[PDB]
Amino acid sequence: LNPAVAPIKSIEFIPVNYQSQNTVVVKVTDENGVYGLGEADGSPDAILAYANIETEHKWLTNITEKAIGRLPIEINAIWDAMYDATQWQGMRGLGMFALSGIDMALYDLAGKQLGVPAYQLLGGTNKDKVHPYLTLYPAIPDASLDVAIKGYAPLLEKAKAHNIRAVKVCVPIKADWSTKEVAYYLRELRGILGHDTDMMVDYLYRFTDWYEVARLLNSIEDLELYFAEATLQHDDLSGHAKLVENTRSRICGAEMSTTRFEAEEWITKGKVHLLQSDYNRCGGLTELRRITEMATANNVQVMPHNWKTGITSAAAIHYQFAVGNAPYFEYVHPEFCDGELRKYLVTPEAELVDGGFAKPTAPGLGIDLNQEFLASL
């Protein structure tokens, strides 16, 4: 057998704060010193504590215990083991963020051992390139319609200049615009962007009444927006079904969810067009694979939520090549987003050429920490 396939020796959770952007790097190392990198969402110190709890019983075990000593190649089996041993407090919520980080690191570690890029461990690909949609947000107050539009105007011009195939814009949380003003706002941005680029919208959960949201969405149908994200409260699945039944917009769901079980509910009860389960929240690449194959059979697209560091971004590219079932996937690019962690935490940076990425050639996720940057916090 392949000697490089060695059992996991250790797994450490490494908080990384930068003055308030942060993440929790997950490092899994085998007995030969080779290691994989992943990252978990959630308050770094809460995640670190959870990752260091004492095992108490069958359903309340330390998350890393079931992985240490196992062969990194058995990613599916290791996932089941960790999940089963942590049911008392990790079936949903924060605990799943920790499991995600480990699952992610395993694809990077397994890739290095076998000498293959992570997407080849996920089924391989028939695509020659993938194209992300970029989430854009200017450094604005929440501001006024004028400030917001002026702040977006250039990011949108820059996107078109770079031939980005799709972009997502947001409605400022603290903004107090009426739905009539939101429509105007979106019309103005779409006016700036043009119709050759797909445009997604994140309403940041500013609504609670499906009826009002339906009136808004049905009034801007002419804008041919790609989707409507975070319209109603995340727990309001029946409310989302109402939107699907009464509008012609693509309705998204599950951005903050965890596991395929919550994903299944969004599909059947929420009737949503697209799931946004996050790499570093819902159960990693392994759970996103099950979620996506289930989604496909149900005519539901999956565009995993993504706004962390270069670690998740790398996982995102690999996901899109072997698992993705949609035209785009969420990605945060350094030239279209402020944030040092995203910018320098890991290297190298995937090269975006004409709005797309080429197939990964390096082992695993093809990334490593920028010791220099990390050396300074």
Residue whose C-alpha is closest to residue 280's, from 105, 108, 100? 100
**Pick from a second copy, Mg ion, none: which does 146 bind, CB < 5 to 8 A by kind?**
none
Q: How many angstroms separate the CA atoms of 184 and 177, rounded?
A: 10
Could you tell me which stretch among 15-23, 46-54, 200-208, 310-318 binds Mg ion (CB under 5 A)?
Answer: 200-208
297 counts as binding Mg ion under rule CB under 5 A: yes
**Pick from a second copy, Mg ion, none: which does 1 bind, CB < 5 to 8 A by kind?**
a second copy
57 counts as binding Mg ion under rule CB under 5 A: no
**Pick from Mg ion, a second copy, none: which does 120 bind, CB < 5 to 8 A by kind?**
a second copy
- Smallest distance from the beta carbon of 369 to a second copy, in angstroms? 15
Q: Which helix (H) or strand (E) holds 135?
A: strand 133-135
**Pick from a second copy, Mg ion, none: which does 53 bind, CB < 5 to 8 A by kind?**
a second copy
Q: How many angstroms separate the CA atoms of 292 and 319, rounded?
A: 10
Q: Which is nearer to a second copy, 22 or 158 (CB)?
A: 22
- Smallest distance from the beta carbon of 166 to a second copy, in angstroms? 13
Amino acid occupying residue 148: A
Q: Which is nearer to a second copy, 153 or 182 (CB)?
A: 182
Kindly state the DSSP code that residue 165 receives in the 8-state scheme: S
Q: Which is nearer to a second copy, 361 or 376 (CB)?
A: 361
In order of 56, 134, 169, 294, 335, the CA distances from 199 in angstroms are 49, 10, 7, 26, 18
Q: Which is nearer to Mg ion, 202 or 262 (CB)?
A: 202
**Pick from Mg ion, a second copy, none: which does 370 bind, CB < 5 to 8 A by kind?**
none
Q: Which is nearer to a second copy, 91 or 153 (CB)?
A: 91
Question: Crossing angle, helix 284-297 and helix 259-268, to 10 degrees?
Answer: 20
- Smallest distance from the beta carbon of 68 to a second copy, in angstroms? 14
Handedness of CA 84, 89, 93, 99 (dihedral sign): negative
Q: Which is nearer to a second copy, 150 or 218 (CB)?
A: 218
Member of 103, 202, 278, 330 binding Mg ion (CB under 5 A) = 202
Q: How many angstroms separate the CA atoms of 221 and 246, rounded?
A: 13
108 counts as binding Mg ion under rule CB under 5 A: no
**Pick from Mg ion, a second copy, none: which does 202 bind, CB < 5 to 8 A by kind?**
Mg ion
* DSSP characters over 191-260: HHH-SSSEEEEE-TT----HHHHHHHHHHSGGG--S-EES-S-TT-HHHHHHHHHH--S-BEE-TT--HH
Amino acid occupying residue 164: I
Binding site for Mg ion (CB under 5 A): 202, 238, 297
